[PDB]
């Protein structure tokens, strides 16, 4: 019964490593690992290395495709130092570990042979600032599709992929819970752009960033596990981020375990869960690769689109 997809387990997947080199040390992996994430070198080797191989294979093939169009159009040819940027989306729930997957992927790709320039941008820079969300009644919907300046986000990625020298994204601060005035992330004709955020795989009545992706990941897990990870990270942040007096959620620093669980579950119930179910999970069917994690953050299963 034919399928666009093929499923693997970790055994099956890790065999596809071939002889892709491991270019990353244990200390280097630490700088990449997010609070609460469990990634080790073994996981890098068995899961991320075949991924990086898949992508290397696709970057070459995908260039052919733009080149055929440029040929058709009777066009100059290509700068071989500036190919069309390969755009990689990374999607999934809050707390599922997207930021680790993306940082690790970036680090692996930047260590391929020619040392490609590999940029990583998070869509939280494209959230409306609080004063605008407040205007729109959206202060309790950060991460919902409507809380983003989608036009700006699409402009940004179109600019990069169309080969602009320079493009700027705004910058969000979790600690201050708002866009940072005057802050910009500048992307300068990278070879590869990884775009990471809850809703990057969305589709709609207009052309969207997902329509520009040459590859996408969705980082998945059971909803109950993701909630547990969220609540557990909320409790852990009492003595990390929330302990900063400047932190927007500094008042949570002093909560007891049981108060903190209450608070975190209410945020999950009223914001992150509804967003996952209504907006994020309906984008999973389109991902080129789903990385499914077990309750321990271990990626044990994968679903690859072959069509």
Ligand X SMILES: CC(C)(COP(=O)(O)O)[C@@H](O)C(=O)NCCC(=O)O
Sites of contact with ligand GDP (CB under 6 A): 34-35, 92, 94-99, 174-175, 237, 241, 249
Angle (nearest 5°) at CA 203 between 171 and 57: 80
User: In angstroms, what is the minimal distance from the CB of 237 to a copy of itself?
Assistant: 33
| Residue among 87, 171, 188 nearest 126 (CA) | 171
96 is in an annotated binding site: yes
- Using alpha carbons only, give the angle 111, 117, 118 rounded to the nearest 5 degrees: 75
Q: Select 153 or 241, whichever has its Cβ closest to ligand GDP.
A: 241
**3-class DSSP assignment, residue 8:** strand
β-pair type (289-293, 299-305)? antiparallel
Candidates 302, 277, 299, 300; CA nearest to 289 is 302
**Is 93 annotated to bind ligand?**
yes
Residues 50-109 that bind ligand X (CB under 6 A): 94
Contact 271, 141 (CB under 8 A): yes
CA nearest to 214, candidates 53, 58, 52, 51: 58
Binding mask 259-288 for ligand X (x = CB under 6 A): --------x---x-----------------
Q: Which is nearer to ligand X, 68 or 243 (CB)?
A: 243
Residue 203 near which of a copy of itself, Na ion, ligand GDP, none (CB within 5-8 Å, type-dependent): a copy of itself
Tell whether 204 is in a known binding site: no
Choose between 84 and 108: whose C-beta lies nearer to ligand GDP.
108
Which of 37, 43, 119, 124 binds ligand X (CB under 6 A)? It is 124
Count of residues making up the chain = 307
Q: To the nearest whole angstrom, how small is the minimum distance from the Cβ of residue 197 to ligand X?
A: 3
127, 135, 215, 241, 264 from 139: Cα distances, Å:
11, 9, 32, 21, 17
CB of residue 165 to Na ion, shortest distance in Å: 36
Answer yes or no: are the C-beta atoms of 174 and 237 closer than 8 Å.
no
Nearer to ligand GDP (CB atom), residue 60 or residue 277 = 277
**Footprint of ligand X on 169-188 (CB under 6 A):** 174
- Beta strand 167-173 with 178-187 is antiparallel
Strand (E) or helix (H) holding 175 = none
Q: How far is the CB of 279 from ligand GDP (least distance, A)?
A: 14
CA angle 112, 115, 120 (to 5 degrees): 90
Per partner kind, with CB cut-offs from 5 to 8 A, the member of ligand X, a copy of itself, ligand GDP, none near residue 159 is a copy of itself
Q: In 3-state terms, what secondary structure has residue 137?
A: coil
CB closer to ligand GDP out of 248 and 286: 248
Among 142, 150, 189, 238, binds ligand X (CB under 6 A): 142
How many other C-beta atoms lie within 10 A of the C-beta of residue 72? 8
The two structure tokens encoding residue 18: 């071939």
**Nearer to ligand X by C-beta: 41 or 271?**
271
Q: Which is nearer to Na ion, 218 or 229 (CB)?
A: 229
95 in a known ligand binding site? yes
Is 99 labelled a binding residue?
yes
- From candidates 198, 209, 212, 226, binder to ligand X by CB under 6 A: 198
Instruction: Specify binding-site residues for ATP.
Output: 92-99
Residues within the interface to ligand X (CB under 6 A): 94, 122-124, 142-143, 174, 197-198, 267, 271
């Amino acid at each position: 019964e034919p399928s666009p997809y093929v499923e693997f387990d970790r055994r099956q997947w890790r065999a596809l490593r071939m002889s892709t080199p491991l270019a990353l040390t244990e200390e280097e992996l630490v700088g990449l690992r997010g609070l609460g994430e469990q990634i080790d070198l073994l996981e890098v080797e068995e899961v991320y290395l075949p991924l990086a191989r898949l992508i290397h294979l696709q970057v070459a093939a995908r260039q052919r495709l733009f080149a055929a169009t440029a040929e058709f159009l009777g066009e100059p040819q290509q700068n071989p130092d500036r190919p069309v940027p390969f755009i990689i989306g990374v999607a999934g729930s809050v707390a599922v570990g997207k930021s680790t997957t993306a940082r690790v992927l970036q680090a692996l790709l930047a260590r391929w042979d020619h040392h490609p320039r590999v940029d990583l941008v998070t869509t939280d820079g494209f959230l409306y600032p609080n004063a605008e969300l407040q205007r729109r009644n959206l202060m309790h919907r950060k991460g919902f599709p409507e809380s983003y300046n989608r036009r700006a986000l699409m402009r940004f990625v179109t600019s990069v992929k169309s080969g602009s020298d320079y493009a700027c994204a705004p910058v969000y601060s979790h600690l201050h819970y708002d866009i940072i005035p005057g802050a910009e992330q500048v992307v300068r004709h990278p070879d590869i752009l990884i775009l990471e955020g809850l809703n990057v795989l969305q589709t709609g009545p207009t052309l969207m960033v997902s329509d520009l992706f040459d590859f996408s990941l969705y980082v998945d897990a059971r909803i109950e596990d993701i909630e547990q990870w969220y609540v557990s990270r909320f409790l852990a942040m009492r003595t990390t981020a929330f302990a900063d007096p400047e932190s927007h959620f500094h008042h949570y620093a002093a909560f007891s375990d049981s108060q903190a669980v209450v608070a975190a579950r209410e945020i999950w119930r009223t914001i992150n869960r509804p967003n996952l179910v209504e907006n994020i999970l309906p984008t999973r069917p389109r991902a080129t690769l789903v990385l499914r994690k077990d309750a321990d953050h271990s990626i044990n299963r994968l679903r690859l689109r072959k069509l």
